[PDB]
């Protein structure tokens, strides 16, 4: 849907079937999915020493 | 959130005004917009039932 | 649902596509290997209070 931008009375909205870009035929599925890169190496303090 | 190695099956349908054979919303009609006070951006509406 | 975003007393109504090319103004889809453009003006003209 597309909502038309009247400078009109504010009590009403008119919606029209939007035509739309081709992407939206499957952006309607890919809303639920995100992709991430693992960062498997990390550092943190504790009280130990390497032996020398 | 759940991690997964692959998506569910997504079918490459093509259409303009109405979305066909795609996935239905879980409980109720859901309506999605990028920034709803902007007329240039389409509202996507996803149904709960199909309509045949 | 639209009533939640725009407010309960809004007189929401639908209308058909305004004008321009067949490909952008109509349903533009394939059935069975054949390409259909269909005039959705029958669906989109309800009005609500």
């Amino acid at each position, epitope marked *: 849907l597309t909502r038309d*931008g009247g*400078s009109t009375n504010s009590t009403t909205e008119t919606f029209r079937p939007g035509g739309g870009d081709m992407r939206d035929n499957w952006r309607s599925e890919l809303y639920k999915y995100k992709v991430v890169k693992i960062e498997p190496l990390g550092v943190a303090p504790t009280r130990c020493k390497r032996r020398v | 959130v759940s991690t997964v190695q692959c998506t569910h099956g997504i079918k490459p349908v093509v259409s303009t005004q109405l979305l066909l054979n795609g996935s239905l919303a879980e409980e109720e009609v859901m309506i999605r917009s990028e920034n709803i006070t902007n007329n240039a951006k389409n509202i996507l509406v996803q149904f709960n039932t199909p309509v045949q | 649902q639209l009533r939640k975003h725009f407010g309960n007393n809004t007189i929401i109504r639908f209308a058909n596509s*305004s004008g321009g090319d067949l490909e*952008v103004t109509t349903h533009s889809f394939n059935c069975g290997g054949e390409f259909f453009y269909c005039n959705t003006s029958g669906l989109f003209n309800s009005t609500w209070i």
Partner: antibody
Amino acid sequence: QVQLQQWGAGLLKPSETLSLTCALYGRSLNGNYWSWIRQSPGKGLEWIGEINHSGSTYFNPSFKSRVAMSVDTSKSQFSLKLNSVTAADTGIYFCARGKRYSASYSNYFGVWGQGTQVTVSS
Amino acid sequence: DIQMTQSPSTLSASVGDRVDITCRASQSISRWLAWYQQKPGKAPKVLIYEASLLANGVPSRFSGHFNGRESATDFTLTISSLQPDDVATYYCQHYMADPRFGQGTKLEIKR
């Protein structure tokens, strides 16, 4: 019912400041921007800028160095001031209703005042 | 900035004729255009907005046309059956950015 009326200075000498008042009837300024537009026979129509009930503004770049606008939501009024007028500022000036706040692409001017004629001469 | 070119500059036709006025944006305006009628010595009045919708109180003989696609540049106002009252100056105007009017077209009736 919704309308505006406007008035102010008719004759100005060069380098003076123009000042014009616009008053609404039958509604408040909220929910819309408001603008001034002017006509001169050498240029057709020019948009000057815009204001709102919050008194924030945005101005057409060529005017931003000379223009000011103000609002008075208690009187249902807004106004325009234009510094350092020259013969080229001669014309008819109209205040008009602009875009509505909940529709970011709606800046086309639905209602206009009767307009006022400004002559800039000695 | 984005600027509007009208064509023709002046026009004449007789009562009951169709009349067409055109406007072209200097680059694509997605559909954010309006048309105005000005009587001599009066404020303009809006006729059409979003290139194609009628304003309220416009007689249904007025109409807008354009190719509909989101990259449009070329727009038309068609007076589908001219009447004695339609003698006026007509301006297009975009609102993609700052509002810019076209130079206006004048229509005078043949009798």
